[PDB]
Amino acid sequence: KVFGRCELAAAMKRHGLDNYRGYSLGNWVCAAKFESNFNTQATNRNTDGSTDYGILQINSRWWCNDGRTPGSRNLCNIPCSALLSSDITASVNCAKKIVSDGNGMNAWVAWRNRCKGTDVQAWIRGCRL
Ligand SMILES: [Cl-]
Ligand SMILES: [Cl-]
Secondary structure (H helix, E strand, O other), X not given: OEOOHHHHHXXXXXXXXXXEOOEOHHHHHHHHHHHHXXXXXXXXXXXXXXXXXXXXXXXXXXXXEOOOOOOOOOOOOOEHHHHHOOXXXXXXXXXXXXXXXXXXXXXXXXXXXXXXXXXXXXHHOOOOO
């Protein structure tokens, strides 16, 4: 599924991401825009052999099992395919674990390079929330 901006903001709010670990809703919407272009089915292979999955591009080396990443830890205890669903629940639940791991949202390269230190409130402007 490709989400609209406000539709995703509302879904993320319902799943408790607004101000989760101090990160306002706009941060999460901005990260999703630049990680996946709001597409739940996005996948990208990395040089180390791992793959990033879904709306928040969660990586198979640490967080989910895709059956082809040797030495993967599967910390979210889910198949990576579950992260591609139109229902973002699995992605949100896993993201909550990632953001709590010590480095906050810096775990998402696109967030660090394209969202951090910008007016992220713009990403939820105009939305009925
Ligand atoms: Cl915000
Ligand atoms: Cl933090």
